Design an enzyme around this catalytic site. Structure first.
Site, short mmCIF file in Angstrom:
data_model
loop_
_atom_site.label_atom_id
_atom_site.label_comp_id
_atom_site.label_asym_id
_atom_site.label_seq_id
_atom_site.Cartn_x
_atom_site.Cartn_y
_atom_site.Cartn_z
N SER A 1 -0.76 15.63 -12.13
CA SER A 1 -0.99 15.14 -13.30
C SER A 1 -0.63 16.74 -14.34
O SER A 1 -1.36 17.47 -13.52
CB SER A 1 -1.85 14.20 -13.11
OG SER A 1 -2.39 13.93 -15.12
N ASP B 1 0.97 -1.04 0.04
CA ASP B 1 0.07 0.09 0.14
C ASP B 1 1.31 1.13 -0.32
O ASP B 1 1.74 1.68 1.16
CB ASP B 1 -0.80 0.16 1.42
CG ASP B 1 -1.85 1.20 1.39
OD1 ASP B 1 -1.76 1.85 0.79
OD2 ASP B 1 -2.70 1.67 2.33
#
Length: 330
Positions: free
Chosen positions: A199, A35
């Site tokens: 992004s 994770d």
């Protein structure tokens, strides 16, 4: 040193991925959920409340000659999905794919929430976010990666998740045969303890690319792709009959649909998520309403590039002094 381990979907939907991890001496192999959105290595154990264990493999520290109680240390974690676990702490030898760390903090669960009990395939979590998020008190502990880092050939790990198929976690090296083209690296902020990056935009299907900054985290422990409501609405508007359902808890679409791809930007590069990766199947057995793999982050407080996004790429988690993230097509 290096390590290389195969990671395998837990079910036919890729709801999560499990990776075998050797703990203790002699080795006890548990299948852990790696994770990159948390920083605790915790396991089902001989200490876990019996009624909260249902099929998981447990770690039994009393059977490990290298286990030592970390005296006075406790831990307690709550995840974004509302799940939680807590307990005490041992140090022991932990190996992943041939890479060994001695003195790793292994957090033994005394209590786990229902979601964990109900998932018989996940024996615990191995956190790979920054150690500043580790919950052990009063002495915060380091992640497996942080402990391994100095010994690694290069201070990196890579995630190469499969679509309905196994994939690979590598530690200490970049497998140049595992991706196509070049890797595009992008800046990381560690201010919130995550692999947080920005992004450069998105496209829906064959549509034009929209240049827009989307801050979010690369999180292997989250199943879906969670993005701003504007972006998500633009995606689902291209699927006839798709709608957001408050009763179901997100966007659903007719199972008869063919889903468009979704592209996200990494610098000037582009990662394309095929439409099939966005299908999470019937909301309940036999239903013709299917659950979408792109969902709104509104009210999460952060955008999350979860498995839906990451499995479309070869992803480098570069833990150099100034960390960065790399993405390549594959």
């Amino acid at each position: 040193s290096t390590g290389s381990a195969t990671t395998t979907p837990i079910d036919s939907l890729d709801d999560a991925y499990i990776t075998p991890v050797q703990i203790g001496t002699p080795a006890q192999t548990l299948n852990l959920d790696f994770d990159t959105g948390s920083s605790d290595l915790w396991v089902f154990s001989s200490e876990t409340t019996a009624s909260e264990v249902d099929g998981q493999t447990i770690y039994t520290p009393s059977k490990s000659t290298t286990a030592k109680l970390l005296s006075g240390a406790t831990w307690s974690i709550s995840y974004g999905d509302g799940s939680s676990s807590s307990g005490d702490v041992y140090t022991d030898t932990v190996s992943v794919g041939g890479l060994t760390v001695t003195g790793q903090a292994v957090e033994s669960a005394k209590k786990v929430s229902s979601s964990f009990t109900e998932d018989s395939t996940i024996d615990g979590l191995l956190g790979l976010a920054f150690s500043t998020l580790n919950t052990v008190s009063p002495t915060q502990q380091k992640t497996f990666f942080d402990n391994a880092k100095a010994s690694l050939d290069s201070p990196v790990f890579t995630a190469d998740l499969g679509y309905h198929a196994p994939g690979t976690y590598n530690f200490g090296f970049i497998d140049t045969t595992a991706y196509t083209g070049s890797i595009t690296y992008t800046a990381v902020s560690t201010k919130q303890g995550f692999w947080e990056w920005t992004s450069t935009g998105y496209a829906v299907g064959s549509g034009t690319f929209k240049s827009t900054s989307i801050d979010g985290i690369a999180d292997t422990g989250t199943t879906l792709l969670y993005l701003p409501a504007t972006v998500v609405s633009a995606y689902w508007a291209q699927v006839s009959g798709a709608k957001s359902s408050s009763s179901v808890g997100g966007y659903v679409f007719p199972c008869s649909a063919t889903l468009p791809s979704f592209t996200f930007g990494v610098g000037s590069a582009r990662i394309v998520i095929p439409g099939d990766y966005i299908d999470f199947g019937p909301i309940s057995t036999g239903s013709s309403s299917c659950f979408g793999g792109i969902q709104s982050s509104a009210g999460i407080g952060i955008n999350i590039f979860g498995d839906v996004a990451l499995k479309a790429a070869f992803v480098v988690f570069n833990g150099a002094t100034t960390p960065t993230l790399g993405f390549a097509s594959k």
